Symmetry: D2
Subunit: 319 residues, 4 copies
């Protein structure tokens, strides 16, 4: 039976015997995402070039996501990549959830018409205290739901919650997300590696060794294929679907990595873990780092379990 994202989430809420606050939050985020998809695809640019005689996309996506999340009456703290401070929703529109999100990841690459996406992660406010940004600083392990939408050749939403990962595809002709892959699990070992090899001179010796093992295999197996789109969502998605490892490791220029923790690392780490994968900083699992700044960055090496173990072994070999 076809199932849409909306009929799936609603039914899952019924099983969960929830009041419907998270379901609203999610039905809101699903509209924000169709609107961002529509804009990314440039529906309307004829008007910008004077067919009849606008905001930069990342400003617009931040506004659509934030406006729909406030109007859901399910949020109290929202953290966005675009905003230096956590937004505390006005009491009238308050609910119990905290939402960390990256509205248009890889937006830099839009001029080059590169895949771009939206990352989000949902924490329940654990405090009984008046909402402050101290409610967003929860470890990834405490996530209720997390996921991403990827605006590629087609638009796909991947939604991860305690039951697992489910992929959903947008049909633009009717504005519905159809369930196309349920209970997605990742390849145990894959054949591809992703990292920006441009930083070769600033790489950590353990990273340096791991790539070489993939280029010139000791046991003279097939060399691993290289791929690096440079937009996190395109890269974790291909890693989920096909398997392999994605690395955005700590390199000398940026000792804590470059990728932000709450809205890029923890959502992706949670997807990867619920699909049978792993995500590690090198030292710990990404989902266990306890955040001290809502915009804190983390190293991330994530992907197919065997491949992350192999990296972790060359890593442990340099302690």
């Amino acid at each position: 039976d076809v199932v849409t994202l909306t009929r799936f989430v609603m039914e899952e809420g019924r099983k969960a015997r929830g009041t419907g606050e998270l379901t609203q939050l999610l039905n809101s985020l699903c509209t924000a995402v169709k609107a961002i998809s529509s804009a990314v695809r440039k529906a309307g640019i004829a008007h910008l070039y004077g067919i009849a005689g606008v905001k930069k996309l990342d400003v617009l996506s931040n506004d659509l996501v934030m406006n729909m999340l406030k109007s859901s009456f399910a949020t109290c703290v929202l953290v966005s990549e675009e905003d230096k401070h956590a937004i505390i929703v006005e009491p009238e529109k308050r609910g119990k959830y905290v939402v960390c999100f990256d509205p248009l990841d890889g937006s830099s690459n839009i001029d080059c018409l590169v895949s771009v996406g939206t990352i989000f992660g949902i924490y329940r406010k654990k405090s009984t205290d008046e909402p402050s940004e101290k409610d967003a600083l929860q470890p990834g392990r405490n996530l209720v739901a997390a996921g991403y939408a990827l605006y590629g050749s087609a638009t796909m939403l991947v939604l991860a919650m305690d039951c697992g990962v489910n992929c959903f595809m947008l049909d633009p002709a009717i504005g519905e997300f159809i369930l196309v892959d349920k209970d997605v699990k990742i390849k145990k070992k894959g054949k591809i590696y992703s990292l920006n090899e441009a930083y070769a001179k600033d790489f950590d010796p353990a990273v340096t060794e791991y790539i070489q093992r993939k280029k010139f295999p000791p046991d003279n197996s097939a060399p691993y294929g290289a791929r690096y789109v440079g937009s996190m969502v395109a890269d974790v998605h291909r890693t989920l679907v096909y398997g392999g490892i994605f690395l955005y490791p700590a390199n000398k220029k940026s000792p804590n990595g470059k990728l932000r923790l709450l809205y890029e690392c923890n959502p992706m780490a949670y997807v990867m873990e619920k699909a049978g994968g792993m995500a590690t900083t090198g030292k710990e699992a990404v989902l266990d780092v306890i955040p001290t700044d809502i915009h804190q960055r983390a190293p991330i090496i994530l992907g197919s379990p065997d491949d992350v173990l192999e990296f972790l072994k060359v890593y442990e070999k340099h302690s």
Copy 2:
């Protein structure tokens, strides 16, 4: 004030005093690219998943049928077809179109950028059409371009006057001209190639890549980016500048990419944008084919980046 692809192509056709045949051909190609864009975006998959109770094949069919219908073609060479398709006599015209309907079709599962590459040579031969009519060097190209289905659908069309990028507005289904007489940056900052095959790279491309991560003059290293979809990687080179290399690595030491419908369109585009495209040994538009599916090595990009590659190449010959 607005120009659409249709008004541009019709107007250029007028300036050139053409019979209207190449104009009818480019229009058919435009409709095909929109129909492929809608199908790449999965418009209608709810009907597959049973709401009311192949894509690369579809793309090939859409292009084939539209081109035949244009009454502008005599020989059609496709990536999906082992032999050149010769048009029925009634539907014949003077042009030869070589096209890869959906480059990177593998990647559609990972929803990675996909594209339609195409080249148009005029049939100069007096004879009845045959596969040999597709064996003309890229230097004999009348027009070429691609359509990328990346985060938005953009068509890049290059003809004698220069390159022009067009943005598809899906709402009204119209390609609006967004960039005229495009010229690529002289030097770029990104190098693109699959470093997995490092084990099989001839010493010159190995030395080239090293000079990009550890620069002799102490500049900053180039960034690395590799979609693994030629159209995607060449459009980022066209727009952001840089160099793209699918060299002959020992595993497939003739290159991978095909000359008639992959390398020569992107090469023609690069030359009309002020760029360069080489096999290392010679310029890609000049290598005369022996086989419609002949592979070639190709290195293309900003003039000073491709010039830099040629210098380490010649320092190994």
Copy 3:
């Protein structure tokens, strides 16, 4: 704040402390309707005219399938099917839905507005589901409404709390709420019926019409509009006020529009919008169905206009 048909129905759902059966049924209906809208706007037909080489059945199938799949229906009565469909025991829920999948389908050739009409009852008996659960008088409706595919697509949804109108934004696949707690004008200035039947009208309606063209006093005449598809005509009546009439006539002694999925849904919308709907002899919402495809007379619209019809009607009984 924007409110969409999805966010609005959820909230009504939580206020009503429902189990979510009806919310799932209304979510299902929403999807079906955006799918029928696309099919009506002829999306994809290029494919049929060979770009690469009956609308009501597809509409019946989209509403039928989305409804069995909601797990909330147990008896479905469509205009298309001669018998009430009984849902399969695994897929049963408590609601009984009567619907006309693409009302006005006969005029789609002439590109006339078309729409979908639905009513939702709640099964009353504990017996095995049968055609008899569908036979409840209109007064017992939990919700009812229609979707008009006109110059834009609109869904009007009446529930006990009131009538609300939603507009489809086709760029994002969302029904945005544009009018909330609609109420109809008390007296209108448009009368709507097929005056071609004049030879067969009973004297009450023949007097009533003459009374609108030649006012017995000296009011301006009422203007006349008859699009010819109930959804288009009753939607104009709701928005602009007036009266719509499709009475019995000798050839249709019992009327022509069907009680269960045409008259009762519109009567419920009229009545919750502060309007009236009558057969002439009794309110449409109070007649008891004996058969599912039963015909009935209906005059509906602004309260003052319908009352003035009822006075000339009773003057001839």
Copy 4:
């Protein structure tokens, strides 16, 4: 096997050996009609309703106007929406005068019924500096005319000297597909269309005619009646399914209410080219010499035999 509007129009420009200017005008108009259909269908209303935190017929006029000036094919543009004729800037002038109603019946849009765009195109017949007088040509001199109906699907009906051709917009690729070729009207239909409020003000010929239509003298079946109140929807149903449309003169002007240059003449032209008729009661609509760009005219149009039947009872009350 498709032929699109772009291909049909281009192939036809080539056969007629034109310079290509009429082809640029007609191409420009096709885009403007697709831009309007998107707007009519409410694509984007979420932004107006604040998803991120009449104007429709003024926008329609802006889309048609700016697309035709840029075609470089026009020199005088007469719009319903504008009091005076627009003269094109000397550097963008071509040889065509276009008369158009950019969104016909945009009163019915609240109620969401069918609205449409109507146009007729003329060639400038004199050497003089362009003026409103260039637009003052009887419809007999039209080069091409048509309309676009934004009904349940969007359709463009184009009528040129060779015939009337109906094209359907596939919105999923924005392409007008030729769905029917060289269209001909039925000789006689079974629908009559007019607003019967005016019964009080109807002159005796149309009162007699409509009466013969509901109480048919020869005891045949009576005609059905339909009236949408948007001329595009009403004339289109008349083309497609046959019958008669009337919007006659009465005390609300002895001259009718619809307009000659951009409502009457385009539909009168399409009607004749589909094998139908269009009269003012006295002269064929395509022959009345206009003297003002917003001049009104009575119009009865439709199947040949039906218009001929009205002319018989019209002539009876003179």
